[PDB]
Amino acid sequence: QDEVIWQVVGHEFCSYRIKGEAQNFCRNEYNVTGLCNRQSCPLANSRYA
């Protein structure tokens, strides 16, 4: 229920992702770093702060 929601939203399509050219950014309002990383995405990471 976590790697399920990262191999769906982290690699196929997530509505918050922004294809940058050296990075990718997450448009979520509960992101702590602004980037769409594994240890950063608020959807896959299911205990967050």
Partner: protein, 136 residues
Amino acid sequence: RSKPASENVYLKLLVKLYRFLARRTDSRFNKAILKRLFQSKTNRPPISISKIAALTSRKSASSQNKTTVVVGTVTDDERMLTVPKLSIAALRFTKSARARILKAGGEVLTLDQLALRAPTGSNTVLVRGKKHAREA
């Protein structure tokens, strides 16, 4: 071969588990379980419920508590009438094999439940299926 040819994201998970288990342990089991998940569908042939019951239970019938392990599909043989108390662990089970093991027998496992039962792969058998189609 370094990454599976498939896009089954329930099989990127297994490779993410057995390529961890390949490098943090000293077993060549995990360096053989991983060395098969990359192989294509024609390279992992099926193996029947009768050839499994014949492989373990022969000569002295040493079938005490070892889990047969095939990285393929455990199909059925219906010419086998009675099924012994077996225990298998494969990716796919056909719906007539999974109901012919449990009806009188033991456990049907994915390689997940194998890695929490024999993490270093002791007390197992690592069988294959016949690659031979005799012309194809």
